[PDB]
Amino acid sequence: IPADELIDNLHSWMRSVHLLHVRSEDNTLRYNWMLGVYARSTNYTTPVGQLVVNAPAILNYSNPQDAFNSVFVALGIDYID
Amino acid sequence: NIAVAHTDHLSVVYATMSNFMLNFTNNFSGNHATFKPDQYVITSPEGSY
Amino acid sequence: LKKIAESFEDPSSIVVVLEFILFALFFPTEFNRIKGDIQNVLLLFFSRWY
Amino acid sequence: TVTNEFASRFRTIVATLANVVNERAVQDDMQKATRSCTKQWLRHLETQFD
Amino acid sequence: PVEYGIFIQRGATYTINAAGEFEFSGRNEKWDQSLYLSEHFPALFSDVP
């Protein structure tokens, strides 16, 4: 492998990765990566990913656990895998 | 062969049009990248527009 | 109320929530008794919709 | 003389209930076209009310 | 096909942020006429290389 190919080539891919989000003002908010980028994988086909399409602001949590709690009450689902 | 007429004849019948009465809007098309027309809604204090 | 099953899917489903508005105006009493059962089918609009 | 506040109260409902429909971000195409052709019902109905 | 998925990757449409360059939406929507007189442009017409 050229140590020059993958350094230029890996960039070409990483460049083209965009994950839906909302820009916030409050300083006490942390974006939820893990679950959020999972939706971008399937293609927003699944409801747990079709829920994040409509209102992307569901991923802005200020306290852990409360992040997931919301993605349950608004689904009636008992567990995401 | 069309290039001759479509340049110095079918282009005079256009330059005239933009001067007519009853024609009052700007359908500017140069640069598609950034052009939106204008909304001119007739609003009322009550009711809908 | 004669209950309805409608998952609020498209923007054209606002024709159900608007019906519960107009019913709550021409008959404000007679809407008190059924306010809870009409609330049960209204929570789907506040969950799935937004 | 020519006010009728009950008719205007409904006009306010139609006004604020329009934004909920004119905001619902749909993930489709014709389901976005049905989002536009709904105001030709949302506004027509409010005139019939007055 | 080999590089179409690199185009439709960044977005099908876009908007313009207040004073500045374009803003491509990471979504892959189909186009419709209802969008025309409102917001968003068909991104297959913007010019950012």
Three-state secondary structure call for residue A62: coil
Secondary structure class of B36 (helix, strand, coil) = coil
Residue of A69, C7, C4 lying closest to C20 (CA atoms):
C4
Q: Is the distance from CB of A20 to CB of A53 less than 8 angstroms?
A: yes
DSSP summary character for residue D7: H
What residues in D contact C48, CB-CB < 8 Å?
none
Subunits next to E (3 or more Cβ pairs <8 Å) are: A, B, D
Experimentally, how was this structure solved? cryo-EM
Tokens of D8: 């205007």
At a CB cut-off of 8 Å and minimum separation 6, what does C16 contact? C4, C6, C8, C45
Which residues in chain A are closer than 8 Å to C47, comparing Cβ atoms?
Answer: 73-74
In B1-49, which residue ranges form alpha helices assigned H by DSSP? 5-8, 12-17
Residues 6+ apart with CB under 8 A from B47: D11, D46, D47, D50
Inspect the interface and report whether the beta carbons of E45 and B33 lie closer than 8 Å: yes
User: Using CA atoms, how far apart are residues A67 and A29, in angstroms rounded to an integer?
Assistant: 11
How crowded is residue D21: how many other Cβ atoms within 10 Å of its Cβ?
Answer: 19
Half-sphere exposure of D41 (CA within 13 A, CB side): 12
* Helix A33-42 × helix A47-54 angle, to 10°: 110
Q: Are A71 and A78 in contact (CB under 8 A)?
A: no
Q: Burial of D32 by CB count in 10 Å (0-12 exposed, 13-18 middle, 19+ buried)?
A: buried
Residue A48 and residue A39 in contact, taking contact as beta carbons nearer than 8 Å:
yes
- Find, among B11, E14, A55, the residue nearest to C47 by Cα: A55
Number of neighbours of residue A58 by Cβ within 10 angstroms: 18
Mutate to test the interface with E, among A11, A17, A18 (most CBs of E within 10 A): A18
Reference D11, options E11, B37, B45; nearest CA is B45
**Chain E contact for D30 (CB, 8 A cutoff):** yes
Partners of E13 in the beta sheet? E42
Q: What is the DSSP letter of B33?
A: G
What secondary structure does DSSP assign to C1-50, as a single string?
Answer: ---------SGGGHHHHHHHHHHHHH-STTSSTTTTHHHHTTTTIIIII-
Residues of chain E contacting residue A16, judged by C-beta atoms under 8 Å apart = 6, 9-10
Q: Phi and psi (nearest 5°) for B33?
A: -55, -35
- A5 to chain E, closest Cα gap in Å: 19
Structure tokens at B39: 């909304």
The structure tokens listed for A44 are 């927003």
As a whole number of angstroms, the distance between CA A19 and CA A72 comes to 21
Residue A60: phi and psi, rounded to 5, are -90, 90
Q: How many CB atoms lie within 10 A of CB E44?
A: 10
Chains that touch A (3 or more CB pairs under 8 A): C, D, E
Q: How far apart, in whole angstroms, are the C-alpha atoms of residue E45 and residue B29?
A: 13
CB E1 within 8 A of CB E16: no
Contacts of D35 in chain E (CB under 8 A): 34
Pair of tokens at residue D3: 């006010």
Q: Does D50 touch chain B (CB under 8 A)?
A: yes
Our CA angle for D8, D9, D14, nearest 5°, is 90
Per DSSP, the three-state class of B32 is helix
The gap from C-alpha C37 to its chain's centroid, in whole angstroms, comes to 9
Cα separation values, C31 from A78, B15, C23, D14, D40, Å: 34, 66, 8, 20, 29
Q: Which chain E residues in 1-49 lie under 8 Å from chain D, judged by CB atoms?
A: 27, 29-35
Q: Tell me which chain A residue has its CA closest to the CA of residue E27.
A: A20
Please list, in sequence order, all residues whose beta carbon lies within 8 angstroms of the beta carbon of residue A28, skipping any fewer than 6 positions away: A62
Phi-psi region of A69 (alpha: psi -120 to 50; beta: other; left: phi over 0): alpha
